[PDB]
Design a protein around this ligand. Structure first.
Ligand SMILES: Nc1nc2c(ncn2[C@@H]2O[C@H](COP(=O)(O)OP(=O)(O)O)[C@@H](O)[C@H]2O)c(=O)[nH]1
Ligand SMILES: [Mg+2]
Length: 395
């Protein structure tokens, strides 16, 4: 693809593996015009269909106007919105991670900062594997020097559950290593009261709530640090939801005011959030990709098995059942008399074996026949091992 187009930096393959584009994306970071500039890396993550691409496109306008006149402008009132793909409706757009395929070059200290923008697949989409999207979000969190966590309406169990998962995908993703985080609450219920003091007061309330829980130590660390801020945008109005060119004139008045304020904060903060490497040196473009590769390999090394809560509950209970059945077998073997003749013992062990396979199937929970078969085969393998060793030793 040619410059000034989104390109897909990361995608997911059949087997849930994260794959980087080692050509186009790689070459994008290593262009010799800016490869040695310090970078600012802005990533956005969060729930699907909540205006992430839309917001990135408006930030992009501000970056281009900064590139041009060193002034922040969100464009003319009738200019339709373009850039990353953004669309109304329920169906899914962004898959994997997309980036704008050129940096925006901003003036800094007699030099330049190369600004890269990453747009991440939305969470809570049942057509994608949730673990896959957790990994994509964690990757965006790791590489970011400014992370936007786009939140629908308010912080809920869902957003805390997910950010805590993102921050556990290796020590690279822990809150102390996250240079800067915006908790950006879209569709804030109050179109008039959305400023910095409202947001800080809101987070202080939330910290009070989290102090009473065990579930979110990493998010709690983040909210208490100087590395995380909250911003609020009211609802944009029905001229922006549904069929829309995404124009400034289409926006609710209070939405446009908060949007202009927020985008300006982001842009003006760029020089204070230059990306750093592990050791705190300023990272250049020419080394972002190496970092992306290394952590993609880390993320591909483990399967966590994140699933729906009912399936994880069934997994816990069924794993407990397997262990109980194995222990029941072990106890049964330990209780046999050493004076029984070997062939009579083999029949008795064999019958208990079969009986315990039946017991597993009678108590296994859930309706996934495929999963049941795999677990039963594993139990049969463990029980056969135990049986084999007991019966060879028994004389
Ligand atoms: N409710 C609401 N809708 C928005 C907002 N910003 C943009 N939209 C609309 O939401 C739809 C999806 O936007 P998009 O950027 O593609 O969402 P994404 O899937 O998170 O990237 C589009 O119709 C946007 O015009 C917002 O703050 N609140
Ligand atoms: Mg860091």
């Amino acid at each position: 693809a040619e410059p000034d187009h989104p390109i897909q930096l990361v995608w997911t393959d059949v087997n849930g593996r994260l794959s980087l584009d080692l050509s186009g994306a790689h070459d994008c970071f290593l262009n010799t015009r800016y490869s040695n500039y310090p970078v600012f890396i802005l990533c956005i993550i969060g729930e699907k269909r909540r205006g992430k691409s839309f917001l990135m496109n408006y930030i992009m306008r501000a970056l281009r106007s900064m590139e041009m006149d060193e002034e922040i402008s969100l464009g003319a009132d009738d200019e339709p919105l373009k850039g990353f793909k953004w669309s109304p409706g329920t169906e899914t757009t962004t898959k994997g991670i997309w980036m704008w395929n050129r940096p925006f070059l901003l003036n800094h200290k007699g030099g330049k900062i190369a600004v890269f923008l990453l747009d991440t697949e939305g969470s809570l989409d049942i057509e994608s594997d949730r673990e896959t999207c957790i990994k994509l979000s964690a990757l965006s969190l790791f590489i970011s020097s400014h992370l936007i966590f786009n939140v629908a309406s308010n912080l809920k169990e869902t957003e805390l559950d997910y950010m805590e998962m993102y921050m556990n995908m290796g020590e690279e993703c822990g809150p102390k290593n996250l240079q800067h985080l915006d908790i950006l609450v879209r569709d804030w219920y109050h179109s008039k009261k959305w400023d910095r003091d409202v947001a800080r007061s809101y987070i202080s309330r939330e910290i009070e709530k989290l102090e009473k829980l065990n579930s979110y130590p990493k998010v709690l660390w983040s909210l208490k640090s100087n590395q995380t801020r909250c911003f609020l945008l009211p609802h944009p109005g029905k001229g922006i939801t549904g069929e829309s060119e995404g124009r400034l004139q289409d926006m609710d008045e209070d939405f446009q005011e908060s949007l202009r304020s927020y985008v300006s904060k982001v842009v003006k903060g760029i020089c204070t959030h230059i990306k750093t490497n592990i050791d705190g040196e300023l990272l250049t473009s020419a080394h972002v990709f190496s970092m992306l590769q290394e952590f993609t390999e880390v993320l591909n090394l483990q399967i966590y098995g994140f699933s729906s809560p009912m399936e994880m509950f069934y997994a816990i209970k069924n794993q407990k059942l397997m262990g109980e059945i194995e222990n029941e077998f072990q106890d049964f073997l330990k209780n046999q008399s050493s004076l029984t003749l070997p062939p009579t013992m083999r029949v008795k062990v064999s019958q208990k074996f079969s009986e315990l396979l039946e017991k597993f199937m009678q108590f296994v929970q859930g309706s996934n026949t495929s999963s049941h078969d795999a677990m039963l085969k594993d139990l049969e393998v463990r029980l056969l091992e135990i049986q084999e060793k007991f019966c060879n030793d028994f004389t």
